[PDB]
RNA sequence: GUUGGAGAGUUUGAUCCUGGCUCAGGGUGAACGCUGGCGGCGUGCCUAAGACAUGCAAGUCGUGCGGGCCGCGGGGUUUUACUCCGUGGUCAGCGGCGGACGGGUGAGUAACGCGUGGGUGACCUACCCGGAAGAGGGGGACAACCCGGGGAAACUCGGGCUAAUCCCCCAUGUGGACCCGCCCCUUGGGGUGUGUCCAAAGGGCUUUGCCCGCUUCCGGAUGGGCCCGCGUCCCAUCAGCUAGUUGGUGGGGUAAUGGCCCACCAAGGCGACGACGGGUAGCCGGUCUGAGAGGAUGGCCGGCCACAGGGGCACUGAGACACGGGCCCCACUCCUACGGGAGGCAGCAGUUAGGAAUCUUCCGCAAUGGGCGCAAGCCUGACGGAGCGACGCCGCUUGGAGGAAGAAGCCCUUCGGGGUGUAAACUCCUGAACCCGGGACGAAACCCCCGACGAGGGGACUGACGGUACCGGGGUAAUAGCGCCGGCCAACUCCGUGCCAGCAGCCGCGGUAAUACGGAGGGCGCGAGCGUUACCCGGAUUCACUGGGCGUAAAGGGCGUGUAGGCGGCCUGGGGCGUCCCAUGUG
């Protein structure tokens, strides 16, 4: 299935915050905040040089975890941007944002990505006016990501549809706060997304 | 046993025994045309030739010889009799023969 | 286009028949230098006209015997023994390279 | 004889049919001599049926026999229509 | 958008080069182990072309025709016997069309078998389409049925009746065939002149005309035989093979050319540019690998081939030399009265065998396809679906939001403390499964009336998946498992053990401080899969066209001569074979 387990420990594995714990992950709690060093018995001891391949892999893992999809199809998404006409680093992401489970988490309707998924899986979501239980979902420019009326008066929807009067979307996006709607303007750029990944280093792991 | 099948082999038998009668008539008859052709009896050979040539064609309407294969046996005979009568005497009838 | 072939007769020693040597040039499948490889076509010459060493064209045709599938079109040149010697030199040399032997 | 019929090119529960000209005894979905259109019987599109009339109108001056199904799909294509007075 | 190319480990006290073995990457018709919740779509005897029980797998037309039987209804007699017409249940037969298509398996073949492209003036072609014409007259058979004989059986023998689109003679012959003649073309192609020969069959109904048929002829299309050009694995530790062998004239045979086959005559044919023998394998579209060039491979789907227990053979027919047709021998199995006969799944499904491994004796002919029929219809183990198998790819759940300066227990500790770890406990939220109801598309044809039998229009029939998918409502917190952690290779410590026990792909670890063995805690990678074994490619510029080398590293023949073959100087011109270019047909 999906990975399911001790999430804020990769808040610390690759050494920087991955906001996957979600609304806690802006505390002086999310695990990183306390103890930067990554897991078990040794995590505090002196860390030596990382192999050329170490680093090659770290920065791949980060981007795989951070987006909350498992390897086997993190691949067919890479290998589907390769097969596509344009910059490979920049196409890749481009079809991470078009996935449904992170079409929500940037459209507001959730606290973290792992949560944001549940709402997709469970019949809660509208796509060009229909119900989609499919995180694997290719959201195109002009699509309509909303909520089905039935779930609307749920707290989790709403405390989150709240806070959005203090934030903004992401410039490829209109949020319709009140009407509970959302619109996919275009794809992103590598202009926008300021992730803590370096993407060529990802591709240099999918060269070997 | 499968009575769709058996039917067609009993069938076979009956046509083989009409196809035997057909051919093994024509051999016989046309051999007795070659024969009268040798010693110049242009009268009689040219008779036998036509009662050969027809028993040909009527085995050609049927499924014994083909039009291609029956036409064949017409040229075997017709020519070879027109030619045995070379080494003898001129065609009396001119039945199955074009001068 | 019942194929047309230019080759030089190398065998008279048969009846209404004759052997012809046609050759072709081409880049080697892989290695790709021009090579030149040839083959001999048992042609049909009825009236017997063409002789031992002539330069002829042949065309694909109604099968005449077992290995006769070419009639002879026309003559491009007569007298060209140069190759008939060469072809016989090759045919000769088989006398050598045997594990019967070759004497001095 | 020469015939015109239907040949499968979908999968389980998802048939998409092809219009074909092919020799009677030939295997169903086999080396046909001419594709003259498709027919979507699950009809999931605006274009769930194309034919092109002018070929089936050579192909019957030809003398290629339709099915029932395929016959009905040609009348409905316009294939068999007449005009003037 | 030149879209595309990662290497390390190991010879030595060490260093540079050669060079092999080795690992990392992707790949399957997979199996094996620990583990295994689901669905969609694929897919599943790779081994014995070993042997198969039972059922089905090709038949259909009563509008080609005559009866059996078992009834049912109506007629000639006042009543019986018996006989007359139709009709229903039905069963073989006579006849037509089909059985050669579909399906299966690669045993066989190194071959015109397959791929590519051409010849066929050397050819056939059923049902379908168009065009030209014609069905007049006479005769007889074989079944079915009846009566009789052989036989354990298989079934086989005998004489009699009879019809028909079954068989035959006569005529007309628009046309066609053959012989000979001329005239174009030029391998047997097209015309024309005389002689010669051949046609047919009737059933049905909306009966004085429409339908399914019938016969001879040119043509369309379709499919197909046959022939050639190039392509088509290895070993020369196989170098010489050939007597129907190569060619000639006559002949037979076929739809057709031809040693194909026969007779007779000349002595040829082939081969190092691999003849011959031996070994192996169906070939291809494509499939996997790879930067490319190549290397590997041809299950499924599709195109061509070849077989139907082994082998030879012909009949019927347009077609085969025929899987569920036929004649003969052999092996094997089986019935037997010891004369004799039966039998063929590599068609679906299963059994047995073998083997590391490969499944249901399922539903339905609704769809689609084929046979037959005027039609309703009929057969359809093709096929459409379901079942079983994580075998494979993809889609999906096992929660999520909050939560301690951070519980217990478990491990390390330098005894201060570090780690599992916000993970758990509880707080809140959502609701796979399940429950209730509704509930498909896939299917409009053939048919029927209108209308002309046409174009067009109207009505009717029908769902094996399935009470599935999907929509409305309800609702529980709700499977985790494998490999690894010295280097290459992401991951570090305590004990136990002490060259023992053991790991291992390579070098290697273990002889009381083991990051290597077995456990624990901790860690990395993956997730309904994770590993191991086998094979294909990459790595491997370690077969080197791209892209290599010989002084010592594996390697220059011990030296010449010279044949095949490979290669070649300067000046101009003709050819255009190569090579370039454009249009076109094919792929
Ligand atoms: Mg629901
Ligand atoms: Mg015959
Ligand atoms: Mg050393
Ligand atoms: Mg690679
Ligand atoms: Mg693997
Ligand atoms: Mg088990
Ligand atoms: Mg097998
Ligand atoms: Mg009756
Ligand atoms: Mg077949
Ligand atoms: Mg061989
Ligand atoms: Mg009798
Ligand atoms: Mg007559
Ligand atoms: Mg008749
Ligand atoms: Mg009659
Ligand atoms: Mg083999
Ligand atoms: Mg390479
Ligand atoms: Mg191969
Ligand atoms: Mg296949
Ligand atoms: Mg068998
Ligand atoms: Mg046999
Ligand atoms: Mg069988
Ligand atoms: Mg049908
Ligand atoms: Mg499954
Ligand atoms: Mg398993
Ligand atoms: Mg998956
Ligand atoms: Mg939680
Ligand atoms: Mg409908
Ligand atoms: Mg390491
Ligand atoms: Mg181990
Ligand atoms: Mg120790
Ligand atoms: Mg250990
Ligand atoms: Mg190589
Ligand atoms: Mg070298
Ligand atoms: Mg040396
Ligand atoms: Mg030496
Ligand atoms: Mg020169
Ligand atoms: Mg010059
Ligand atoms: Mg040129
Ligand atoms: Zn976090």
Coordinates of N, CA, C and O and ligand atoms in Angstrom, one line a residue, chain A residues 8 11 18 20-22 25 30, ligand 39:
Chain A
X8 N 7.2 12.1 11.4 CA 8.3 13.1 11.9 C 9.5 12.2 12.5 O 9.5 12.0 13.7
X11 N 11.0 13.9 8.9 CA 11.1 15.4 9.3 C 12.6 15.5 9.5 O 13.2 16.4 9.1
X18 N 10.2 18.1 6.6 CA 9.3 17.7 5.6 C 7.9 17.9 6.3 O 7.7 17.2 7.3
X20 N 5.1 17.0 6.6 CA 4.2 15.9 6.5 C 3.4 15.6 7.7 O 2.4 15.0 7.7
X21 N 3.9 16.1 8.9 CA 3.1 16.0 10.1 C 1.9 17.0 9.9 O 0.8 16.7 10.4
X22 N 2.2 18.1 9.3 CA 1.1 19.0 8.8 C 0.8 20.3 9.4 O 1.2 21.3 8.9
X25 N 3.3 20.3 12.3 CA 4.7 20.6 11.7 C 5.1 22.1 11.6 O 6.2 22.4 11.1
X30 N 7.1 19.6 15.9 CA 7.4 18.6 14.8 C 8.8 18.2 14.7 O 9.7 19.0 14.6
Ligands
LIG39 ZN1 6.3 16.3 10.3

